[PDB]
Enzyme design. Structure first.
Site, mmCIF file in Angstrom:
data_model
loop_
_atom_site.group_PDB
_atom_site.id
_atom_site.type_symbol
_atom_site.label_atom_id
_atom_site.label_comp_id
_atom_site.label_asym_id
_atom_site.label_seq_id
_atom_site.Cartn_x
_atom_site.Cartn_y
_atom_site.Cartn_z
ATOM 1 N N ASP A 90 0.798 -1.227 0.000
ATOM 2 C CA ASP A 90 0.000 0.000 0.000
ATOM 3 C C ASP A 90 0.836 1.285 0.000
ATOM 4 O O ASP A 90 0.569 2.250 0.722
ATOM 5 C CB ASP A 90 -0.982 -0.037 1.185
ATOM 6 C CG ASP A 90 -2.039 1.061 1.118
ATOM 7 O OD1 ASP A 90 -2.285 1.627 0.021
ATOM 8 O OD2 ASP A 90 -2.641 1.349 2.180
ATOM 9 N N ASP B 199 2.934 1.885 7.593
ATOM 10 C CA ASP B 199 1.854 0.984 7.236
ATOM 11 C C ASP B 199 2.222 -0.096 6.214
ATOM 12 O O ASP B 199 1.415 -0.419 5.335
ATOM 13 C CB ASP B 199 0.681 1.808 6.702
ATOM 14 C CG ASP B 199 -0.661 1.157 6.971
ATOM 15 O OD1 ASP B 199 -1.671 1.632 6.400
ATOM 16 O OD2 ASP B 199 -0.704 0.182 7.759
ATOM 17 N N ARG C 232 0.153 9.114 1.052
ATOM 18 C CA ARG C 232 -0.530 9.131 2.351
ATOM 19 C C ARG C 232 0.140 8.225 3.395
ATOM 20 O O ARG C 232 -0.002 8.450 4.600
ATOM 21 C CB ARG C 232 -2.013 8.732 2.205
ATOM 22 C CG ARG C 232 -2.235 7.366 1.567
ATOM 23 C CD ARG C 232 -3.712 6.958 1.496
ATOM 24 N NE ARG C 232 -3.821 5.643 0.872
ATOM 25 C CZ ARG C 232 -3.704 5.421 -0.437
ATOM 26 N NH1 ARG C 232 -3.491 6.431 -1.274
ATOM 27 N NH2 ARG C 232 -3.747 4.184 -0.910
ATOM 28 N N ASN C 233 0.882 7.215 2.943
ATOM 29 C CA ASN C 233 1.538 6.306 3.877
ATOM 30 C C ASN C 233 3.000 6.607 4.097
ATOM 31 O O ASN C 233 3.730 5.798 4.670
ATOM 32 C CB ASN C 233 1.377 4.849 3.433
ATOM 33 C CG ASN C 233 -0.037 4.358 3.598
ATOM 34 O OD1 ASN C 233 -0.738 4.753 4.535
ATOM 35 N ND2 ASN C 233 -0.470 3.489 2.697
HETATM 36 C C1 LIG Z 1 -2.293 7.044 8.647
HETATM 37 C C2 LIG Z 1 -0.790 6.659 8.741
HETATM 38 C C3 LIG Z 1 0.051 7.549 7.769
HETATM 39 N N1 LIG Z 1 -0.236 6.578 10.141
HETATM 40 C C4 LIG Z 1 0.372 5.362 10.375
HETATM 41 C C5 LIG Z 1 -0.038 4.076 9.868
HETATM 42 C C6 LIG Z 1 0.717 2.929 10.209
HETATM 43 C C7 LIG Z 1 1.862 3.015 11.037
HETATM 44 C C8 LIG Z 1 2.603 1.702 11.325
HETATM 45 C C9 LIG Z 1 3.303 1.555 12.715
HETATM 46 C C10 LIG Z 1 3.957 0.150 12.821
HETATM 47 C C11 LIG Z 1 4.982 -0.036 11.665
HETATM 48 C C12 LIG Z 1 4.257 0.202 10.305
HETATM 49 O O1 LIG Z 1 3.605 1.502 10.287
HETATM 50 C C13 LIG Z 1 2.273 4.297 11.548
HETATM 51 C C14 LIG Z 1 1.510 5.457 11.201
HETATM 52 C C15 LIG Z 1 1.635 6.817 11.516
HETATM 53 C C16 LIG Z 1 2.601 7.512 12.311
HETATM 54 C C17 LIG Z 1 2.499 8.918 12.455
HETATM 55 C C18 LIG Z 1 1.448 9.667 11.831
HETATM 56 C C19 LIG Z 1 0.455 8.949 11.020
HETATM 57 C C20 LIG Z 1 0.562 7.503 10.859
HETATM 58 C C21 LIG Z 1 -0.685 9.788 10.344
HETATM 59 C C22 LIG Z 1 -1.180 11.071 11.081
HETATM 60 C C23 LIG Z 1 0.009 11.835 11.578
HETATM 61 N N2 LIG Z 1 0.150 13.072 11.765
HETATM 62 N N3 LIG Z 1 1.388 13.322 12.226
HETATM 63 C C24 LIG Z 1 1.886 14.647 12.552
HETATM 64 C C25 LIG Z 1 2.065 12.212 12.338
HETATM 65 C C26 LIG Z 1 1.274 11.198 11.947
HETATM 66 C C27 LIG Z 1 3.690 9.264 13.334
HETATM 67 O O2 LIG Z 1 4.002 10.384 13.715
HETATM 68 N N4 LIG Z 1 4.363 8.158 13.641
HETATM 69 C C28 LIG Z 1 3.804 6.951 13.071
#
Ligand SMILES: CC(C)n1c2ccc([C@@H]3CCCCO3)cc2c2c3c(c4c(c21)CCc1nn(C)cc1-4)C(=O)N=C3
Length: 292
Positions: free
Chosen positions: A140, A158, A144-145
């Site tokens: 994916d 992700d 966005r990811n």
């Molecule tokens: C919707 C997605 C983009 N989402 C994630 C989606 C999935 C993961 C996983 C964690 C385990 C290893 C694989 O991947 C992490 C994040 C993830 C993280 C962070 C964010 C977001 C994440 C989105 C919203 C956001 N806003 N800000 C300022 C930071 C983030 C962040 O800071 N550390 C992790």
């Protein structure tokens, strides 16, 4: 103990900062090794968990700080990316829209430059090379990811935890390889296809790919040989790179290592590859809220 254990009592939840395929992401403050630090929290089988806990730090992969069990649910504490997802970071740079006064005065269409955009692309390719070399299949890949973390270093998030040469996921159409649209199987080759669309997102400052087209049209149009057109502000070398990522035959697409080499080459040249200056009749690539 296969992961740095963390006490739910040492987690200070703050606000909701986003949402992935599974669950919301929450910003928080935690205590790791006696020190308080920033982090994102995501509520996340056994094999995959070990796979993640074992992964091993890489500057272009969002890092796992620790996990915590609570009410029968497992909460992951993730390295914090202050700048957010790459998609919104790209869209927030469209100064011609966010701050027209600035744009006209500086005669620019973005607060970001060609080099920065190439770095994001290079960062991701480096991370994907690291992951693919360990049999990981993202499934994916998309702006966005991708997270923009400390020092604006791009970090992949992700990513799928099911390792192997190919993975079936019964179950993002605009980013999917043709063979995935037809079979629901993913490989690093289909990850490369998606990376190409990611590259197109980067160059277009976050435009919706295939803006104006329905998913249905893509299903039949892509196999005919149709592909995303070169943004007018994009150099041919970069566009060819994307075209390589989208060859119908999966085994003909480059590897992430080759992609990174081509990007590092461009990064080294004084030459500008992605034009961000304002030219007479400038307009951004569209964002279709109807598809998002
Ligand atoms: C919707 C997605 C983009 N989402 C994630 C989606 C999935 C993961 C996983 C964690 C385990 C290893 C694989 O991947 C992490 C994040 C993830 C993280 C962070 C964010 C977001 C994440 C989105 C919203 C956001 N806003 N800000 C300022 C930071 C983030 C962040 O800071 N550390 C992790």
């Amino acid at each position: 103990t296969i992961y740095p254990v963390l006490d739910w009592n040492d987690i200070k939840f703050q606000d909701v900062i986003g949402e992935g395929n599974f669950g919301q992401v929450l910003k928080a403050r935690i205590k790791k090794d006696g020190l308080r630090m920033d982090a994102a929290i995501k509520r996340m089988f056994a094999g995959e968990l070990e796979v993640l806990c074992k992964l091993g730090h890489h500057p272009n992969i969002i890092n796992l700080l620790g996990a915590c069990e609570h009410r029968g649910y497992l909460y992951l504490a993730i390295e914090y990316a202050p700048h957010g997802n790459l998609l919104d970071f790209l869209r927030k740079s469209r100064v011609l829209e966010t701050d027209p006064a600035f744009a006209i005065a500086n005669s620019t269409a973005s607060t970001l430059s060609s080099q920065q955009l190439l770095h994001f692309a290079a960062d991701v390719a480096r991370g994907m090379d690291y992951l693919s070399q360990k049999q990981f299949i993202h499934r994916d890949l998309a702006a966005r990811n991708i997270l923009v973390g400390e020092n604006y270093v791009a970090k992949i998030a992700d990513f799928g935890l099911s390792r192997g040469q190919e993975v079936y996921v019964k179950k993002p159409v605009r980013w999917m390889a043709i063979e995935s649209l037809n079979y629901s199987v993913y490989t690093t080759n289909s990850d490369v296809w998606s990376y190409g669309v990611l590259l197109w997102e980067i160059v277009s400052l976050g435009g919706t790919p295939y803006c104006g087209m329905t998913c249905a049209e893509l299903y039949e149009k892509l196999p005919q040989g149709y592909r995303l057109e070169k943004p007018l502000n994009c150099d041919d070398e970069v566009y060819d790179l994307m075209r390589q990522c989208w060859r119908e035959k999966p085994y003909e697409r480059p590897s992430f290592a080759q992609i990174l080499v081509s990007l590092n080459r461009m990064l080294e040249e004084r030459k500008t590859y992605v034009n961000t200056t304002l030219y007479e009749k400038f307009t951004y690539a569209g964002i279709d809220c109807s598809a998002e």
